[PDB]
Design an enzyme around this catalytic site. Sequence first.
Site, PDB file in Angstrom:
ATOM      1  N   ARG A 282       0.815  -1.336  -0.065  1.00  0.00           N
ATOM      2  CA  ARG A 282       0.096  -0.113  -0.129  1.00  0.00           C
ATOM      3  C   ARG A 282       0.827   1.221   0.126  1.00  0.00           C
ATOM      4  O   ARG A 282       0.511   2.218  -0.687  1.00  0.00           O
ATOM      5  CB  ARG A 282      -0.886   0.084   1.169  1.00  0.00           C
ATOM      6  CG  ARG A 282      -2.338   1.062   1.172  1.00  0.00           C
ATOM      7  CD  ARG A 282      -3.199   1.024   2.015  1.00  0.00           C
ATOM      8  NE  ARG A 282      -4.265   1.584   1.616  1.00  0.00           N
ATOM      9  CZ  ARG A 282      -4.929   2.656   1.935  1.00  0.00           C
ATOM     10  NH1 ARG A 282      -4.368   3.324   2.991  1.00  0.00           N
ATOM     11  NH2 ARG A 282      -6.284   3.094   1.543  1.00  0.00           N
TER      12      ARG A 282
ATOM     13  N   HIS B 120       0.626   4.158  -2.691  1.00  0.00           N
ATOM     14  CA  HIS B 120       0.206   5.329  -2.185  1.00  0.00           C
ATOM     15  C   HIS B 120       1.419   6.514  -2.421  1.00  0.00           C
ATOM     16  O   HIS B 120       0.837   7.715  -2.645  1.00  0.00           O
ATOM     17  CB  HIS B 120      -0.061   5.686  -0.792  1.00  0.00           C
ATOM     18  CG  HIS B 120      -1.822   5.034  -0.620  1.00  0.00           C
ATOM     19  ND1 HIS B 120      -2.377   5.806   0.405  1.00  0.00           N
ATOM     20  CD2 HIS B 120      -2.482   4.481  -1.124  1.00  0.00           C
ATOM     21  CE1 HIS B 120      -3.539   5.169   0.270  1.00  0.00           C
ATOM     22  NE2 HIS B 120      -3.719   4.401  -0.623  1.00  0.00           N
TER      23      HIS B 120
ATOM     24  N   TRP C  72     -10.706  -8.966   2.385  1.00  0.00           N
ATOM     25  CA  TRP C  72     -11.175  -9.046   1.141  1.00  0.00           C
ATOM     26  C   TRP C  72     -11.162 -10.590   0.946  1.00  0.00           C
ATOM     27  O   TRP C  72     -11.947 -11.214  -0.204  1.00  0.00           O
ATOM     28  CB  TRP C  72     -10.496  -8.477  -0.030  1.00  0.00           C
ATOM     29  CG  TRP C  72     -10.505  -6.916  -0.161  1.00  0.00           C
ATOM     30  CD1 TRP C  72     -11.590  -6.429  -0.924  1.00  0.00           C
ATOM     31  CD2 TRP C  72      -9.742  -5.861   0.521  1.00  0.00           C
ATOM     32  NE1 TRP C  72     -11.605  -4.912  -0.763  1.00  0.00           N
ATOM     33  CE2 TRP C  72     -10.320  -4.818  -0.165  1.00  0.00           C
ATOM     34  CE3 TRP C  72      -8.669  -6.058   1.216  1.00  0.00           C
ATOM     35  CZ2 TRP C  72      -9.526  -3.584   0.416  1.00  0.00           C
ATOM     36  CZ3 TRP C  72      -7.919  -4.839   1.469  1.00  0.00           C
ATOM     37  CH2 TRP C  72      -8.456  -3.588   1.047  1.00  0.00           C
TER      38      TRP C  72
HETATM   39  C1  HEM Z   1     -10.091   2.803  -6.533  1.00  0.00           C
HETATM   40  C2  HEM Z   1      -8.731   2.372  -6.035  1.00  0.00           C
HETATM   41  C3  HEM Z   1      -8.562   1.975  -4.559  1.00  0.00           C
HETATM   42  C4  HEM Z   1      -9.117   2.438  -3.553  1.00  0.00           C
HETATM   43  C5  HEM Z   1     -10.304   3.061  -3.282  1.00  0.00           C
HETATM   44  C6  HEM Z   1      -8.498   1.748  -2.299  1.00  0.00           C
HETATM   45  C7  HEM Z   1      -8.819   1.838  -0.872  1.00  0.00           C
HETATM   46  C8  HEM Z   1      -8.527   1.131   0.225  1.00  0.00           C
HETATM   47  C9  HEM Z   1      -8.799   1.108   1.663  1.00  0.00           C
HETATM   48  C10 HEM Z   1      -9.937   1.955   2.150  1.00  0.00           C
HETATM   49  C11 HEM Z   1      -7.881   0.368   2.198  1.00  0.00           C
HETATM   50  C12 HEM Z   1      -7.886  -0.029   3.766  1.00  0.00           C
HETATM   51  C13 HEM Z   1      -7.162   0.914   4.235  1.00  0.00           C
HETATM   52  C14 HEM Z   1      -7.075   0.534   5.819  1.00  0.00           C
HETATM   53  O1  HEM Z   1      -7.944   0.528   6.505  1.00  0.00           O
HETATM   54  O2  HEM Z   1      -5.779   0.114   6.345  1.00  0.00           O
HETATM   55  C15 HEM Z   1      -6.949  -0.337   1.230  1.00  0.00           C
HETATM   56  C16 HEM Z   1      -6.052  -1.309   1.417  1.00  0.00           C
HETATM   57  C17 HEM Z   1      -5.298  -1.599   0.463  1.00  0.00           C
HETATM   58  N1  HEM Z   1      -4.967  -1.468  -0.792  1.00  0.00           N
HETATM   59 FE1  HEM Z   1      -6.398  -0.090  -1.881  1.00  0.00          FE
HETATM   60  N2  HEM Z   1      -7.376   0.939  -2.582  1.00  0.00           N
HETATM   61  C18 HEM Z   1      -7.564   1.111  -4.021  1.00  0.00           C
HETATM   62  C19 HEM Z   1      -6.457   0.730  -4.873  1.00  0.00           C
HETATM   63  C20 HEM Z   1      -5.314  -0.114  -4.522  1.00  0.00           C
HETATM   64  C21 HEM Z   1      -3.994  -0.438  -5.531  1.00  0.00           C
HETATM   65  C22 HEM Z   1      -4.074   0.341  -6.942  1.00  0.00           C
HETATM   66  C23 HEM Z   1      -3.187  -0.858  -4.761  1.00  0.00           C
HETATM   67  C24 HEM Z   1      -1.810  -1.559  -5.013  1.00  0.00           C
HETATM   68  C25 HEM Z   1      -1.774  -1.793  -6.484  1.00  0.00           C
HETATM   69  C26 HEM Z   1      -3.907  -1.310  -3.410  1.00  0.00           C
HETATM   70  C27 HEM Z   1      -3.326  -1.937  -2.440  1.00  0.00           C
HETATM   71  C28 HEM Z   1      -3.934  -1.956  -1.315  1.00  0.00           C
HETATM   72  C29 HEM Z   1      -3.251  -2.941  -0.261  1.00  0.00           C
HETATM   73  C30 HEM Z   1      -2.155  -4.085  -0.208  1.00  0.00           C
HETATM   74  C31 HEM Z   1      -4.169  -2.673   0.858  1.00  0.00           C
HETATM   75  C32 HEM Z   1      -4.202  -3.497   2.351  1.00  0.00           C
HETATM   76  C33 HEM Z   1      -3.044  -2.528   3.277  1.00  0.00           C
HETATM   77  C34 HEM Z   1      -3.255  -3.311   4.821  1.00  0.00           C
HETATM   78  O3  HEM Z   1      -3.611  -4.281   4.984  1.00  0.00           O
HETATM   79  O4  HEM Z   1      -2.818  -2.730   5.658  1.00  0.00           O
HETATM   80  N3  HEM Z   1      -4.965  -0.571  -3.224  1.00  0.00           N
HETATM   81  N4  HEM Z   1      -7.357   0.252  -0.103  1.00  0.00           N
HETATM   82  F   LIG Z   2      -5.222   1.654  -1.173  1.00  0.00           F
END
Ligand code: HEM
Ligand SMILES: [F-]
Length: 291
Positions: free
Chosen positions: A45, A49, A188
């Site tokens: 992430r 980001h 997920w």
């Molecule tokens: C519409 C696009 C996206 C949205 C709205 C989105 C939104 C979010 C949100 C709300 C979380 C949870 C954050 C938390 O509560 O810790 C998350 C987690 C995550 N996202 Fe996305 N995300 C998007 C795209 C992506 C992309 C492009 C990647 C990497 C290629 C990505 C990788 C991850 C990963 C690995 C997590 C989990 C992190 C953890 O467990 O600490 N996401 N995202």
């Molecule tokens: F994200």
Amino acid sequence: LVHVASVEKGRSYEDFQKVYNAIALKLREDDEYDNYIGYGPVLVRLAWHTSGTWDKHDNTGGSYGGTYRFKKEFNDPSNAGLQNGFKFLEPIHKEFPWISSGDLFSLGGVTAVQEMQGPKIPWRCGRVDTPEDTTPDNGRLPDADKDADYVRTFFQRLNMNDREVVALMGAHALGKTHLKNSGYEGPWGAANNVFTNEFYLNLLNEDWKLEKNDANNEQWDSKSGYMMLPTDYSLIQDPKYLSIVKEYANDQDKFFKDFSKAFEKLLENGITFPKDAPSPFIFKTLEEQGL
Ligand code: HEM
Ligand SMILES: [F-]
């Protein structure tokens, strides 16, 4: 503005291999974090980001400058939770102080994906630290409760097409959402720290109900215990997204291939590589080196 890649002075493949190694070992060794999920997802992430601020129209933001190290970007509400990733990488940086912040941040994601059995992700070096005044303002990263036209539109600003968008989203197989961070709660999927196509499989084969969470946002929940952001769920609402979700839920192989291209590209957006730069590196995993 142009950002020219510039190799850290006198460094080459095996220097970077050593940094991969350090990260990949800490990943192996701090495995209690987040009720055993480990650091992999939070590093992925962080990688996303720190590159995802890019604006194709004027070349601002992006992975080059490592701007995440400055208060403004570091405290973006969209970045809540990432402190843990920076905090993982700070000691690795102290041990290799010669690496640019941009290189650390993006290499972190590449290591995390491989270490979690994902595809090899060729990675290039030469992000150069830029000063505090180059830091993009808050708010360039995507809102979660939006729909497909929002996601397509948002991702045009990263120069990403339909395929890249869906491929990159499959990253949501890793980790979970955390209520204190983003206002959503739940993973997920089950194989929480192994890189698979579980994301497309869960999208399609679960029976989702829309629900309010304890933060008063709505998310799609399944009987199994899984969730989907509205943006996640939008990928099956859009006929042109649905088709590509089906392809990947079907062929982990073609997904790995596509994700690999998209991630590298995501990680490299904004960067001008001089004609005589090194080729991308492909790093050995810990297991390939006999761990
Ligand atoms: C519409 C696009 C996206 C949205 C709205 C989105 C939104 C979010 C949100 C709300 C979380 C949870 C954050 C938390 O509560 O810790 C998350 C987690 C995550 N996202 Fe996305 N995300 C998007 C795209 C992506 C992309 C492009 C990647 C990497 C290629 C990505 C990788 C991850 C990963 C690995 C997590 C989990 C992190 C953890 O467990 O600490 N996401 N995202
Ligand atoms: F994200």
